């Protein structure tokens, strides 16, 4: 019995779906895992990929035995393409990696101080892209129609953040059109 | 729902008349009533009066100063307006009205009216004696959850 | 032009429905003035467009009006005057508009000036207090060579036209065309305007408490000159302007600003927070109620929805507020016609309570709040040189007075250059003055209420109920009714009191309001031989019983024992002075003496 | 007029909402208006003997005239008018104190319902009852699950395993199982994630 | 020269401490609700800053606005035309050299004041961007004008090929910012040997104007340059300061946070308000609890009425102090002036009571009669304190008649009749003729001849002088702990941050919850006054009879509603109860006891 957010989710169980999604890492250490979704290794090789899921190896890294490899589109050169085919298409977002927003937060907790050069941009090249997104998302919320929209590349973040309002408005102008007749 | 929010809103009042004359008076002697006298109705019993008869009781009359000094008002400009020392509610008032009167006319005025008032809300959004406030105020509930939702958003996102 | 014409045109054949209501009435106006001048042995040209007619169908085309009124009013103009002409040619000026309706959202008060709508269309309302003077203006004038008998015209551009900011003509009146003639101007072809600026300050109880009233200033046309009476609820809509060089007609210019705010508006309306239009059925009903022998009862009652009691003050202050005729001698002074009562009493016994209620019903009659200074009945030669030249005998609080009511305070706490004011304007309707300019007689039809407070505590008693106050008895014997106000201590009857004031922390007025106004517009009887009788009886036993008792009466005390009655027989709204209205007249009296 | 101060009611109903909903979880529950009640109380006695004289006369007065069938109208429906109110106000007192009893459902010595708003422990003593038969209720709803799973608290869901937490305003030994932790005052930890839930909730470690 | 702006435009779209990127952060939430404004905030744009202020130190009049053309150029990187320009706000906090260095090292460098604000004028416009015609020859431009040197930073030139000055303003198209000349007065404290205070002139900008009403402690920050005005000797200018940013301390427009309420609530539920105030008002007055319950009450106050008919009632209470010289009547008043929102202190010998509420004079330009002062019109919402109501005869009781009891004043001097509004509150401390004679005779000689002052007000206290050997050894051990030492100084820290309540904590609650709930009392209580005054009279009643006259009339039983009102305002509560009412009269019944003996 909550009674308290019921409607909707709180901002840490959003985080909650999305971390139980698997990665590549690369490893370095050497029974191990029988966690009813394992795949556990033998004596491991460092040097390769593994998709292993990520909450785990979260863990795996504060005790610091493995090293974690960026997702292939978090490099500054390939976030640019991205903004150049929005902002000749003034009508909805293009190319979307549909969870980025959570994923970079957690990726700058000792997840950071990893990669090659990224302070001082990759915070640049975010963040401009947020508001974009929300500059697209008050266009289109002006343009309401009855009982059918279209949204087609939205994150899970907005949609946390969409919707406790989005909907009492329809509804309460749903009674008045269909209650006219 | 027990539905609080407006079991008060028909506790307000609503000025009307008579076709009959009836001897049964709770408002204080002279037990009839003569017919064609002006009322002041709580919005319960003579929602379902103008119904029970053929031919009704009371004489339903319009209170078009809600309807025609108000409509040309917010056929100009959403945006700063008396909403509200006109009627505490603008909204199940608006509703319970249309059902029995049943006319398109100001049902589609009113409808154009919420999406304006909402498209200050929501871009109103992000972070003085008696009158103004309340102004300020009936939009409250209907985003006193929204801009809570962005509060919390805004903690876990940042450290 | 084809840009900035065109939307011009589209609208041209636009608007033409939008006045479907009004093509007749435009020409209606002025086909019976065409035919009462030729038929003699008077209108404006005033079109009013509403904003319904022009909000149900046409979008591009309103907000032009609301954002840039600039580039649309003569525009809506010269598309008017035609339909003027195409409906009336044939029997042998410009029609300017006035747009009246609602606005969403631009009720400016002015203590706010606007960073959002500055010159756009803007509502005031307020008071005004300055009433500048009249000065006409000229717009063309038309030559005429007498020599080859030849004519000319020219048009002077001024900052008048409202919109357009012309290069203007620095310039009075030109001699010598290009001819060897003389010119001659014709002054009956020549037309003229006019042009008053009035200052409006601020409604003072809208306006939150940080701050003296501000004000602002609007130039109107002919149309509604003369409408404007210093102390009026006024409501205007216009133009928001500037004009002036501000920074470059002088040189160095530190510190001066440029950039007048002006308004060049149009169509004010007084307001009520004169024109009380009823219909058949309240003026019916008001007849149907005048039916009843009691409804002068009732409105005594229902006055003061606070105070037990003082029945026979609450019928006087309706006697007194309803006022009484005076018909003026032919070739002779008139007598006094005005009424005028006095109060007094041991303090906080609600004197002043019911004396600034009067103010609110008070149907156009403004009154002061009795600070004595020198000003309230006269002018004090304030001029201000009216743009050098021009000396104005500048209107105290008389022109406000003018068959209104007035209420001062404090007499006894005031200084002796006011009593000897009250004295003038009480013998003699009008006042007189020459300070440093014109003997004017300037009339005033005033009836004053007085509040003061005795001396000595609660010594009214104990020593000679006369000189109780002991200000000059000037007064006293211009003034009738000296109603003694008594506070006695009775268990039931404070005990009354206690819960009235407590019942109240938590028939009608505006009906009775409209039954006295009514009541300003009917005829006076005056004529009764019966009535007339028995007074003079009434008089006589008094007048055994005035001079061996309490306090001398004198013959005007008559006069008021004609006009109680008279105004008695107002309420009654009759033409006959019957015999009941004398009886209420002396036993007023009886308890005001005793 | 009629049902006037069920108005005024239920418009102090919309104060004990606002208060506890925008500020915090703590209630502090205001009070009970028998005083109010018993007001409309009295008007739905009188009311009541009201319309049987009338239900005595319409078989040998007015004879079931239509009138009075209207008269039996407004007397029936100012009955169900305040009807709908006195209940709305019943159930917003009572879907309160169930957050309340679910937050605190027993975690640390249950039946200590006490030290807890003495001035209104009377007023909800007759609801105590009704309180109980709650938390009778919940217990057996913990055992008549099949297996043992937490139904008291542990809403948030977990992030980390090592979580250094602080203590203050405590003494004793408490934790007797899942090994003791040897509080003493004012004093910090470093422990694991799930043992810590049965005592943030209980009110005794402070801060995360 | 240029290229600053690639230094400032490529500067405050990154500037963040530890992943917060605030200065996006904030713009995005102000370009969306109006208001078009910045704020700067610490060290390294200090740290740079000057690195930049190294070469704008040269002249901070010009490159300032050089900064404002670049935040219009990353303002439309967040549109996406009806775009403004913006102003800027400063903050820094050293210290404040009241009026002194003002000619040597301080001619275009920041300066920071503390002053107090008296005299506002009235609006004004000035353009910000024209269009210019061209006579004959018909050129069209449009120039901006927008940082100053009061008017003519630049001309308009001859050049369009027609006449000379051909250049004239339109007003088609063309916006405007308004100017102030606000008066401001230094703070009476700080240079104290023999010398009258100066005074200043200052203008502003729009989105910062308004906001201030004269009465108020304030500290500004801004340029000190100079204008010319040729309306004396050699070619010399003026002093004045442009302001930029007013980082004030609160108005003392109800608008704040949210944390401050927070802990209101949480103390408001704690129900011992009304017995810890008494001790943590005033730290350094020995008891006097009859005293100290009258003010608190008076500070707040009750309500207004304008309930639906003509009339009003007046809700507010009026207290006096007469009694002996040495019992604090005095350095009490004093401090209410600092814990009250708005208050002024004209506490001596009338100052020209016909000059009290009014005054008009000649003008300087057009020669007109406007009206100008009064200690009334700036005192409104608050609370006014005089003294001295024994050899003021002339005009202070006739000033004071109209202005009580229905507080709307209307001046009918030369010029205007207007009814300017009026809400205010007075406090009087006076003496009785000499005091012990007063309490040693027959008990009237109060005022001179009249009583219709007395019955004006409600509340009355009449203090004496005891004996009692063991109140006056605490007091003689009281005021030598407060006066050196400072040891209490010590204890009510100590006992301050669990228990007391500081100065500047009482000041921002109380136009809190005077500004938030509005009280009404209960029915329930009407049968009890009732019944209380029916002998309260009867108590008087016995009196007379007795030849004993003097005051009591019915103004007092319509001051204890508003009495018992006061502390309702106090809890919060929208009722009023009967342990509320009978603390009450419990103030009240102990004041009628000494209207009798
Ligand atoms: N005789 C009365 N009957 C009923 N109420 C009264 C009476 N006298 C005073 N009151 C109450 O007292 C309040 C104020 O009275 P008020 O201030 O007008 O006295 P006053 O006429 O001004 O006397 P003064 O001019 O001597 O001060 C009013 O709200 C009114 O309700
Ligand atoms: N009850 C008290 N508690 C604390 N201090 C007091 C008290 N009464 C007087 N004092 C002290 O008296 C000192 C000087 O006050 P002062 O002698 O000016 O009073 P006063 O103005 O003479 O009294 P009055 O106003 O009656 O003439 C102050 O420092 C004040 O602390």
Redesign the pocket.
Known sequence: LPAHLQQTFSPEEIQFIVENEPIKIFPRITWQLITTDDKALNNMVAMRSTEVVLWIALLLKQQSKCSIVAPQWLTTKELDRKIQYEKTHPDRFSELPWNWLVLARILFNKAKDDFHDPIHELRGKIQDLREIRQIKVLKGLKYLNESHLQLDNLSLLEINELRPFITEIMDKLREIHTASL | YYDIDDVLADGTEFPCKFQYDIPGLGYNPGRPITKNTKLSLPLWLARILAIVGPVPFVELLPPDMFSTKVMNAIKTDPVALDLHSINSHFFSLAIKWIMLFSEKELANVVSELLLQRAQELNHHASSTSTFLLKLEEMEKEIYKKSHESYKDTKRWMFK | PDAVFGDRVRRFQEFLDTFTSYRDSVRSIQVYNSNNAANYNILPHRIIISLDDLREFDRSFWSGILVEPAYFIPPAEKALTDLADSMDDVPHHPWKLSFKGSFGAHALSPRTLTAQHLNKLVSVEGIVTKTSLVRPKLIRSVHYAAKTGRFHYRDYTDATTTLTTRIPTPAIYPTEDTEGNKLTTEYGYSTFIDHQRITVQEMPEMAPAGQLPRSIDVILDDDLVDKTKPGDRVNVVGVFKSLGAGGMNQSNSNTLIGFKTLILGNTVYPLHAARQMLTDFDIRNINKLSKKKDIFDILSQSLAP?????DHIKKAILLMLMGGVEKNLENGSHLRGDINILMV?????????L?RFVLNTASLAIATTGRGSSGVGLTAAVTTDRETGERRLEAGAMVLADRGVVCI?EFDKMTDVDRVAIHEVMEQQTVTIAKAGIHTTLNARCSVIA?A?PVFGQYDVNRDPHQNIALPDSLLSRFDLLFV?T?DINEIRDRS?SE??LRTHRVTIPFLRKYVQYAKERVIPQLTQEAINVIVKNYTDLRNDDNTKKSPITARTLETLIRLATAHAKVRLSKTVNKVDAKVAANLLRFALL | MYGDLGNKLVLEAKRTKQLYARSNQDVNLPMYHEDIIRNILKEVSNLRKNTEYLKEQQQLGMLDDKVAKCQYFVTLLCMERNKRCLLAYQRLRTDILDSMAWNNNGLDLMSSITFSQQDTNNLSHQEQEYLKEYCDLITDLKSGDLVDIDLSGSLVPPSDVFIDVRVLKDAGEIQTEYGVFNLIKDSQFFVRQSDVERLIQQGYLQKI | NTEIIKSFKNFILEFRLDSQFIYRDQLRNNILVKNYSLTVNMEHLIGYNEDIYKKLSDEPSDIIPLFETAITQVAKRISINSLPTFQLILNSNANQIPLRDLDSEHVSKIVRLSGIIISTSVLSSRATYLSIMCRNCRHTTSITINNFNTGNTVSLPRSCNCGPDPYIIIHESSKFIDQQFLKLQEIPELVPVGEMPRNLTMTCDRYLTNKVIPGTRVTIVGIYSIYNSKNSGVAIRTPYIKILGIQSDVETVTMFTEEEEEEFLQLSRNPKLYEILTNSIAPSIFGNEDIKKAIVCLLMGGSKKILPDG?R??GDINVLLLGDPGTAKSQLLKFVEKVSPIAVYTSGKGSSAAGLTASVQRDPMTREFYLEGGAMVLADGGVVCIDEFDKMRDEDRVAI?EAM??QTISIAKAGITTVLNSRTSVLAAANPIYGRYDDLKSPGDNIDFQT?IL??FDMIFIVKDDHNEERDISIANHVINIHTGNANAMQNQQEENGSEISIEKMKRYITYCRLKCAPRLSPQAAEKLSSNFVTIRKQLLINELESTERPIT??QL?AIIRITESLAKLELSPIAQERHVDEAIRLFQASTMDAAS
Request: net charge negative; aromatic share 2%; proline share 3%.
């Open positions: 606070s105070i037990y009691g003082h009493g041991d303090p906080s016994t609600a004197k002043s309570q004396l305070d509040a407070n106000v506070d009191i009235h004031v | 009339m009632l007046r008649h009891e229905q219709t019955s004006r019915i103004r319509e």
